[PDB]
């Protein structure tokens, strides 16, 4: 009865930019992860600290789902330990990450002949993001600490768009990513598999 709403995470119409990634807390339902691992349409399917295969036998406190778009060559940065512009400045998995990383090609939805520029990423910041931190700001970044009123030299626009073209190479093509994070605190189990 209490079928967990993974279909509205995965089959949602629009995904957000990676700098402005979006979280759905999922609790207090019954889960069927076999909807995920039966399918062959994922290009990335990696689970850390837990097999996908055994997920229907476990019970968890909170399951979080995090979603965003990256270009194809950036999907590798959504893994524990990795660095680069996406891990450093947009979305960061912790070292002791428990969960899955799920990605599929969306060149049919999210590219264009002229170029899709709707998906942004941050490329500079004062520090690296902590695990699961988020930076939504629209400021001018000064390397020293000065006030900047216009984007100039030593006064940086910190955001840049991906440009998604339909004819591009597969590493420059858009990919929707869903990151499933699993907790089971001293809290009672709210999410369970069918078994």
């Amino acid at each position, epitope marked *: 009865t209490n079928l967990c709403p993974f279909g509205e995470v995965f089959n949602a119409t629009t995904f957000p930019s990676v700098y402005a990634w979006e979280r759905k807390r999922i609790s207090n339902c019954v889960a069927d992860y076999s909807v995920l691992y039966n399918s062959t349409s994922f290009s990335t*399917f*990696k689970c850390y600290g837990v097999s996908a295969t055994k997920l229907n036998d476990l019970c968890f406190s909170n399951v979080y789902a995090d979603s965003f778009v990256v270009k194809g060559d950036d999907v590798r940065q959504i893994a*524990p*330990g990795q660095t*680069g512009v996406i891990a450093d400045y947009n979305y960061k998995l912790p070292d002791d*990450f428990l969960g899955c990383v799920l990605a599929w090609n969306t060149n049919s939805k999210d590219s264009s002949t002229s170029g899709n520029y709707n998906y942004l990423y941050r490329w500079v910041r004062r520090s690296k993001l902590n695990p699961y931190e988020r930076d939504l700001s629209n400021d001018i970044y000064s390397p020293g600490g000065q006030s900047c009123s216009a984007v100039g030299p030593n006064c940086y626009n910190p955001l840049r768009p991906y440009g998604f073209f339909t004819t591009a190479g597969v590493g420059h093509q858009p990919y929707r990513v869903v990151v499933l994070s699993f907790e089971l605190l001293n809290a009672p189990a709210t999410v369970c598999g069918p078994k």
Partner: antibody
Amino acid sequence: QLQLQESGPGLVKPSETLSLTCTVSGGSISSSNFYWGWIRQPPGKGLEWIASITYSGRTFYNPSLKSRVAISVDTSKNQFSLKLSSVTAADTAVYYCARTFPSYYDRSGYHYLNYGMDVWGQGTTVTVSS
Amino acid sequence: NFMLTQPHSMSESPGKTVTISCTRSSGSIASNYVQWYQQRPGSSPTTVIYEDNQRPSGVPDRFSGSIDSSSNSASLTISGLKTEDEADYYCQSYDSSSWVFGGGTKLTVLG
């Protein structure tokens, strides 16, 4: 940003035990998503893998070195260590410590683990001589 | 316990594209992940390709990896070859028994 620093004896007499320590910073040796290993390079030659370990104590060895190799982790000092017993001149090499790419399961349930090196240390030169 | 074979050296002009191949002696090259390591003189090795074709951050977009099962081989490919790419390149894989390294390819930029 992870860094790895080898420290070792520099000179070691033949038949004795070579003892090396890698000191982790920017991360914890306790992190059970990763393995941590030792690679060596004799002067003039390429690379040979020695052993790898994770926080539990689970260990993989090069089968030709295994009877002479001991590898351990020390979570209390953020270190892991290698001992290579009964050295000869064929163990003269630069020794590198390293962290692997993280272990993970695929959709079918296969466990990928300890398959390749991601962050390398700077190397420590070991000479075996009388 | 298989071996992996690399050319001892490789020579190409700047701007051209060069490919170091790594041929697995027994088993299938596609059964296990292939890594590529670059080593300059005097330096520790650096990983430039992992999982056959994944490129860590800081390695140029010109470096690319690929697998060819009809010749049972893997390939590092450097496009737009630069003076700065002169180094030794080692491939590496593994089975259930051990990791296996290539013997290394000395890459020389000509002209």
